[PDB]
A paper describes a structure:
Homologous recombination is a ubiquitous mechanism for maintaining genome integrity and also for generating genetic diversity in sexual reproductive organisms. This reaction is catalyzed by RecA family proteins, including bacterial RecA, archaeal RadA, and eukaryal Rad51 and Dmc1. The current model holds that, in the presence of ATP, the recombinases coat a primary single-stranded DNA (ssDNA) to form a nucleoprotein right-handed helical filament, and initiate a search for a secondary homologous stretches of double-stranded DNA (dsNDA). By contrast, archaeal RadA is a better model for eukaryotic recombinases.
Here we report additional three new crystal structures of left-handed helical filaments. First, the basic structural element of these three new helical filaments is a RadA dimer. The other protomers were then assigned as 2ZUB_B, 2ZUC_B and 2ZUD_B, respectively. A unique property of these left-handed helical filaments, as compared to other known structures of RecA family proteins, is that their DNA binding motifs (i.e., L1, L2 and NTD) are all located at the outermost surface of helical filaments. Moreover, the NTDs are separated a long way from L1 and L2 motifs. We found that the locations of the L1 and L2 motifs in the four left-handed helical filaments are relatively conserved, but in contrast, the NTD locations are quite different. The first hinge region, located between the NTD and the PM, is referred to here as “subunit rotational motif 1 (SRM1)”. Subsequent structural and biochemical analysis revealed that SRM1, a hinge region between the NTD and the PM, is not only responsible for structural flexibility of the NTD but also is important for RadA's function in promoting D-loop formation.
Numbering used by the authors:
A (entry chain A): 11 to 258, 277 to 323
B (entry chain B): 12 to 259, 275 to 323
Amino acid sequence: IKTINDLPGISQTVINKLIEAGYSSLETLAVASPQDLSVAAGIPLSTAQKIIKEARDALDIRFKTALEVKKERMNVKKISTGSQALDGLLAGGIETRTMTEFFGEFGSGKTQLCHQLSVNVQLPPEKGGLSGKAVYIDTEGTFRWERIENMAKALGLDIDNVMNNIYYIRAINTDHQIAIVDDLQELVSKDPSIKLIVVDSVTSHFRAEYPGRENLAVRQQKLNKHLHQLTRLAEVYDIAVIITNQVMLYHVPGIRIQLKKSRGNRRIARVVDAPHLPEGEVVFALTEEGIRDAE
Amino acid sequence: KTINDLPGISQTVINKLIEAGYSSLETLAVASPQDLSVAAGIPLSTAQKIIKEARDALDIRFKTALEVKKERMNVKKISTGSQALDGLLAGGIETRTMTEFFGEFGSGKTQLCHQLSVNVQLPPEKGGLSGKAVYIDTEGTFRWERIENMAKALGLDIDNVMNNIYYIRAINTDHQIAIVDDLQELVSKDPSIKLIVVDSVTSHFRAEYPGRENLAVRQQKLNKHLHQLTRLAEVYDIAVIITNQVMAHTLYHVPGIRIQLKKSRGNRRIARVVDAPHLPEGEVVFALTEEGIRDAE
C-alpha cells in the first residue's frame, strides 16, 4: 500500500497530527524513532512504534536469494530509463502491456525522459531495451531532434538509425490527437517492431479546447475514453505506453510517477499511483548524455 | 478537404450535416456514428460512412523522425508566439509565400501582425529569422505600445526592436500601390528584411471602389496588387502577411495561405485553415495576452 491514510488500525485523528508534524511519506515514517515521533506528533509512544511498524512493513522489504532474483529478471522485460535510481524506483524500468504517466511542473524532466525512452527502447535487452521502435505523438511541439542526437551519441549509436526508428507525428488538437490514436492500432499491426508509444502532454489540448469547470465532465469523458484506448493498445499488442501530463482526481492511468525540480540539475521522482510498485522517491539528473543518476 | 467533397455522399445529407453543426472534417472523423445519426437525422449506416470517409480525409501519415528533421533544415518559418497556432501553420508563417489573416474586428489580426513584427527579429533558435520587418499601415493601427509589451516579454531591447521595423502609413490605394512598388528597392537595399506586413490590404479598395457596382474592378485592382506582393515575397525570399477584415461556386482567391480568426470566450481566439496547399485543415485555439500572442490556459 501507499499513503499514511491507508495505515491499518490507525485513527483518522492521528493521521492529521502526523501530517501536521511533517510526516507525509511512509518511507520517512518507516525509519523514524518511535520516541521522537511520539514527541513531534504528540501521539502515545505505544502508537508511534506502531505506525512505524505498519510503515516499515508497508515498504515490503523482501530478502530474496540471488538465484530467485535472477529468475524473475528473465521472466520480465522493461525499458530502462537511464538512471539506475529511477529504474530501481520503477522496479526495473518502463513496463509493456501497461501505460505509465509522468506528471509534474514544466522542466521537471518529463520531456527529456520521453526522449530518453524513445532511444533506449531501440537497445537490446542486455543494455536495457527491447530491440523495438517508438511512436512519438507530439502534442505541443516539444520533440527536439537534437536531444535525440546527444542521447544517441552517448550510447555510441547511429544518429540517423536512431531517428529512423522513432515514428513522429504532430497532433495539433484533440480531434487529431484522438484520430492519430485511433489509427495507431493499424500501425502496430503493420509494424510489430513498435514497442514504445509516447504521447507527450496528452491532457493538454483537452484542457485547452474544454476549459473551465463547465466542460469538466465532457473533458473527462472524452479524455478517459482516449486513455482507455491507449491502455488496451498497450495490453493487446504487448507494448509500453507513456504519457506525460503537465500539472502545477479519479485517474485511469496504471502507473503514475510525479517529477519535481531539485537543486539545479537534480530532480525527484515519486511513485504516486501503482499496484505492484512500493512507494518512495528517488533522485536522478538531467545530463546532456541524457537521463542519468545524480552525482 | 471540406465536407461537400466527400465521396459517395448525397448533397442532401451534406446540409443536415451543416445544419446539425458538423462543418469540419476533423469534427466528423472522431464523432460517434450513433450520435451523428440522431443529431443529423441520417441513417446509422451513412453516419459510420461519413465518419470513415472523414477520418480518411484528415491525411494522417506516420512519418519517420529522420525524414521530418530533413524537412526542418529545408525550410525556415516565423513563430506566432502560440505553439497552437504554429502547429496549425505547420511551424509558422512561411517565407517565399503570402499569408492572409481575415476575420471580424478584434479577432486578433492586429495583435498577430505586431507579434510577427517582433518574432521575425529573433534567431532561428527562438523562432525567428534574425531579420527586420516592414509594417505598411493602411488604417493607422500600429500601436507603438503593443510592440513594447511584446518586446519586454521577450527580454528584448525596446528601442532596438522598434529600430528593426520599417513603418509607413499608406493613406490611400494609390499610395498603397506606390509603396509596394518601391518595396523592391528596399528589400534589395536591405536584404535583412524578411517580413512584409500589410494590415488591411483590401481596406482602401473597398473604400475607393464601393458597391456591387465596382466589385469587378475593385477586385481586378486589388488582385493585381496582391499578385504583386506575392511575387516580391517569392523572388526576394521574404514573408508577406496581409490581414482582411470580414464579417460572419468555389470562390477564387490569390493568397497562398488563408486563415480565418474568430473570437471566443473573452481572452481566447480560434484560428482555422481555410485555403492552403500543404497545410491540413483544422482549427486550433490560442489567446491574446499582454505578453503578446500565446496559447490559451
